[PDB]
Structures are given as structure tokens and as C-alpha cells.
Design a protein around this nucleic acid. Structure first.
Ligand SMILES: [Zn+2]
Ligand SMILES: [Zn+2]
Lengths: 307, 307
RNA sequence: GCUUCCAUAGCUCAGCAGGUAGAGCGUCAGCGGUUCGAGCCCGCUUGGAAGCU
RNA sequence: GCUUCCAUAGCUCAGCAGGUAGAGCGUCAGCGGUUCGAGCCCGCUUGGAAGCU
């Protein structure tokens, strides 16, 4: 599981930063990648990474904003252009269906795969046995969300060499044991899987605030979270500039992380008004509030380890 | 007047070539630039050129195809994002209005300028005193066009130093003369402007075939034209591969130019299946039919001089 | 970096319609182009002043 | 270059459901990871075979 930022920009593309799109790699977790927001030219950034279209299972959009979605049409099309048969679900706000649907239609684009578009709302927007992705409304205007990708706890490791020392040959009967199931051994022996198990490994969590003004909702969404990808469009001083555009300030994101007891904070969606010099300044403004902070940047990849 | 190719690709972006978009620079001609097709990330390519959004007066689309239009939303938006107040007219086929209109709407994008969208059809799609842009149907499916940008003849140079030798002080009365008008001089003198004029300078012409199969219509559209930007998706041999996808072959474009008596041919919309090595091979296949041919490539700029 | 707007005799402010350059007490920043003609229109290169959703 | 699919004892063809490796006359290409356990799942690096709207 790794975070690979494909565009850390804001408003419009700049040679320094492309418009927003953060990729959550879950290849060894579920064999795929999830994009969060897909600003224009996101597929283009990808051609510089090892992330491949067909490997994207689901795109989550934070709020309808060309710098967050003008990249869907061309991306999905490319996935179809290169084969891709798996299903892809786009999760977004009201408007996302129309946008995607119209774009393909006018372009007479027939997708060689199943496209599920879901216009979400607060609460669980996707869940299975491995992950639970809850969304929430953020301060940036009606139809704006912050997402939390929560990986559910994984089972404890199998005390395999106790099973062996008990003369229980390693084989299928093993995974049944790994599942807590009580089984009957070839020797009419009965053991309770649960007995030979290690305490469960807590699962990772990543949060994407999207575009928003300092919010208490968001604070709660990222509780104890592992990584909170937070947008910091402005420096500390421009507190007013942020409020009016419904954005946030480095120091603001940092307070948020600290208050949420998040483990790490990544500042993204930086405005071109700051330089490759200010970028470390922006970062410092945050580090003074929340030690473990990082100013995201195009192609920065941050692995998320099992704490 | 110069042709600056912003994407010479085909189907999908490649680090070598971005998807289609050719810019016709008319800065010293009418203070602006016209884009022909605006594939995704076209604005991005621009950030590497001196062409600026606000400087684009009108985008002409050849046929609805994501690799030709997924770039409008983000481009127009950016023009609005950076001020821009001049009017911008997008000329395209049926579908272009819906696409542009829906994209801005869902994104709640209010344009700080007037946007005129015109869903064209064969014939003159724009004309004034300087230019006449005629469009035509090409072989690539209903709603596919090839454009000819025809600059109208400019007036002959003023025989100024004959006017002087005739003791006619240079001043306003001059441009009236440059206009053929017969005027009355400060000394109740009467001269016929037309008399002191040089033969008119013939005006330049550029053609954009767009995506199409070898066509006789196209051949006629580019008659005597100066530059014919022609799509050559395939090499000579893949004649069948081209026919089926409604595309063209180097040799085909070259025949076309030769037959049209075009002055120069630029091969574009190259498929990634060819390399930076094949690209000169592709070009050679054409040069054997039409000497003056060039394989377009990202950021190639070709000025169009007054022959 | 991006976008836009400025560098007019000795100071301020024009020249907000290309016609040998002004109003109060001068190589119109530079090189080049368009043009009959450029401070005024288009490139390029220097120096400044805002804003960057 | 892109995408996908291959490199299984001596040849062909499996192993198209992770459980000390097969059917006709073997370091499952290599290094590393996940896992109790990997030819089989995920990276990386070598060599091939198509197609690239
Ligand atoms: Zn945004
Ligand atoms: Zn095309």
C-alpha cells in the first residue's frame, strides 16, 4: 500500500505541479490502484509511473471541479483502448454521472468494460471484507466530500510450527485453521484453529480531505488515521484568502492532523504562488504545529506500512 | 503566421507524442492563435510554448473523438481562470455544444468571457475581410470535417516615394490612397489612390484534413494550398489497417498533396507503433511521392511565409 | 515560476483613434519585424508592481 | 517505446481451484516480498511473440 502523488497542483497546471490526483496503490493488497480525484492530464502523469490504466479499479472524486475531474473521460477511454475488462467504479458527487456519461456518448466511446458510476453521500460508500471507505461532507460548498480509506484488520499469523510440533502436517487443513475453524484431522483429531493464532494485525488508514476549509467533520473523519492527505492551498498568513475560496492553510491542516492524532500529514494542492523555495517554507509552517508533515509534490511516493 | 504542433500523437498519449492539437499562430496577423483540435492535455503542452490561453480566439474541431476534444473543458476554463475577456468561438460537429456546455455546467464553471460554440457543416464556417475558413466532410464517419484556413489577398504596397516625389506630404491622406480611394489634397489636388499601388500580395492557405481515409473531397479542399497538415496514422503497407479504421497512410497523404499541387505536406497523428527511427522511415515513404514532406512532432514549428 | 500592467525630456501625468513628440515649475528601455510611416501593432531581451480559487 | 501473453526435466503440452512438482518416447528464467506454505499472488531484472483505431 503506497501513496503516489500524480499531481499536487491547484487551479491550473504548472510545469512544477499538475492538477490534483493521488493514487493509492493496493497491488499486493487487492491487485489494483485507486485514484482520488483525477484532474486533467492525470493519465499523462501516469506514463511516467508504473501505474497502468487497466490496474485502476475505482476513482473517488472529492468535488466537481475541472481540476479534479477533467481527467476522467480520457482516462477511462484509455483503459478501454488498452483492453481492460475488469469492472471500474467511479465514486463522486451529483454531476459525476452526467459528466462521464455525456463525454463518452458525444465521443461515441464504447467501453470494453463495465463502468459503475456512483453519486455518493455521507457514510460508507464502499465496503467489503478487506476495506471500508467512508465519506463525509466538507466545507467547500454543497456536494463536497472527504474520504477515509480504512483497511480492516487482518487475521493474526498462523502459529504454524506449533501445529507441526503437534505432528499436524502442513497442508489445506492449515488455512481452515488460519480461519479459526475447528477441524477434524486425518487422524480423527480435532483442533480449534483459533487456539493456534496470533493477535490480529490492525489495518492501515488513509484520508483525503479533498478541497475544503478547516473542518471539524474532517478532523473526526481522520481520527487516529495513518496518513491524512490534506489540501493546503495557502500559507499561514493568508487565512482570509483561504476562508473566502473555501480552502485551507498549512498551519490549519497541521492543527487538524494534530487534533485528529493522525500519524502523518501530507500537504498537497499547493498554489503556484509559492516556489520550490516557499514549498519548504509552507512545509515548515506546518511542521511547527505537526512535526511529521510533508509538502506533497509530483511523483512523490509514500509507502504506508503496517504500524 | 506559423504552425506550431502541440501534439502529433494518435489514439492515446505517449511520452513521445501527446494526442492531437495543432496551433495556427496569427499574432502579427490578427493578434491571436487558432487551435485545430484540442486533445487532452493540450493546455499542458502550451506551458512549454509561448502560446497563452487568452491569446486563443477560436478552436476548430475535426471530429468528436476524445483524442481531439477532451482538452476543451480544461482549456477554456484556464482562459477564464487567467482573466481573458475577448470572445472565443469553438467550431465543431454536432455534439461539441453538449460536450462543452455540460462540462462547464457540472463543474459550475462561469466563464469570464463570451463563448460561442458553432456546430458546423460543409461550406464557409467563418469569414471576414482577412480570412475565409471553409470546411468539408471527410471519410471518417458522419460528422467529420477537413478545414482550410484561407487568408485573403492583402493590398499591394503603397508607392509612397512617388507620392513624395509628387510633393504629396506623407500623412493620413496616405492610407486613404492605400485604399484605392481617390482623394482631395490640401492643395485641392486630386489623385486616384489605385494609381499609386502595387499588385496585391496573394494570401497564404493552410489545410487540416483531420482524421480521414484517403479522400478526393480533401484533395480539392487543399488545392494549391500552402501547407496541408495531413494525418498519416499508418505506413504504406498497412493500407488495409487504415481503410478499416478510416485512417490514412503516409504514401496516401503524399499522393493527395501531389495531386492537390499543395506546396508542402506535414504528416501528423502518428501511431506509437512507429519509433523515432520509423518516424523518418514513415517520412521517407512520403517523400518518395511528395518531395516536400515532414513528419510532424511535438513542438515542431513551421512558419508559413508569403510565397 | 504563472498572468496581467508598467519603464514618455528635469519630476509628476498624458499621448486611453499608428501621421516629422506633449501638459504643469526627450535614442519615447533596448534589438528586430509589419507598415508609406511605430511611443503607440508583433516578436525578443532587460528592469519594476500586483495576484495566483 | 506502449499493452498484453510467454520462458515447466530431454522435446512437445499441462499444472486454466497457492498444499513436499506432472502427462506422451526439473534452481519450475533470475533477486526480493506476501504467506504456515509460491511454478502458481506482488514488485524488480533478463530473454522472446503479437497489436498499437
Ligand atoms: Zn481543487
Ligand atoms: Zn484522432
Amino acid at each position: 500500500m503506497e501513496l503516489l502523488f500524480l499531481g499536487t497542483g491547484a487551479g491550473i497546471p504548472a510545469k512544477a505541479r499538475n492538477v490534483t490526483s493521488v493514487a493509492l496503490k493496493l497491488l499486493e493488497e487487492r491487485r489494483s490502484v485507486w485514484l482520488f480525484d483525477c484532474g486533467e492530464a492525470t493519465q499523462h502523469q501516469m506514463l511516467h509511473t508504473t501505474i497502468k490504466p487497466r490496474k485502476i479499479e475505482k476513482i473517488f472524486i472529492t468535488h466537481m471541479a475541472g481540476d479534479h475531474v477533467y481527467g476522467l473521460p480520457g482516462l477511462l477511454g484509455s483503459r478501454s483502448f488498452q483492453g481492460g475488462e475488469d469492472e471500474l467504479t467511479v465514486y463522486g458527487p451529483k454531476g459525476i454521472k452526467a459528466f462521464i456519461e455525456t463525454s463518452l456518448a458525444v465521443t461515441k466511446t464504447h467501453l470494453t468494460y463495465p463502468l459503475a458510476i456512483q453519486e455518493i453521500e455521507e457514510g460508507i460508500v464502499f465496503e467489503d471484507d478487506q476495506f471500508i471507505v467512508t465519506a463525509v461532507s466538507v466545507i467547500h460548498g454543497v456536494e463536497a466530500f472527504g474520504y477515509r480509506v480504512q483497511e480492516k484488520d487482518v487475521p493474526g499469523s498462523l502459529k504454524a510450527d506449533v501445529l507441526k510440533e503437534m505432528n499436524i502436517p502442513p497442508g489445506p487443513v492449515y488455512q481452515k485453521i488460519k480461519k479459526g475453524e475447528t477441524v477434524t484431522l486425518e487422524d480423527g483429531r480435532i483442533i480449534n484453529g483459533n487456539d493456534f493464532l496470533e493477535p490480529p494485525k490492525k489495518g492501515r488508514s488513509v484520508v483525503f480531505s479533498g478541497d475544503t476549509r478547516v473542518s471539524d467533520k474532517l478532523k473526526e473523519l481522520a481520527r487516529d488515521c495513518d496518513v491524512m492527505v490534506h489540501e493546503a492551498t495557502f500559507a499561514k498568513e493568508d487565512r482570509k484568502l483561504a476562508y473566502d475560496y473555501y480552502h485551507s492553510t498549512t498551519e490549519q491542516a497541521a492543527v487538524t492532523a494534530k487534533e485528529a492524532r493522525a500519524k502523518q500529514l501530507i500537504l498537497t494542492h499547493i498554489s503556484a504562488r509559492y516556489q520550490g523555495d516557499a514549498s519548504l517554507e509552507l512545509q515548515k509552517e506546518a511542521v511547527d504545529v505537526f512535526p511529521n508533515s510533508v509538502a506533497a509534490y509530483d511523483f512523490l511516493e509514500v509507502n504506508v506500512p503496517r504500524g
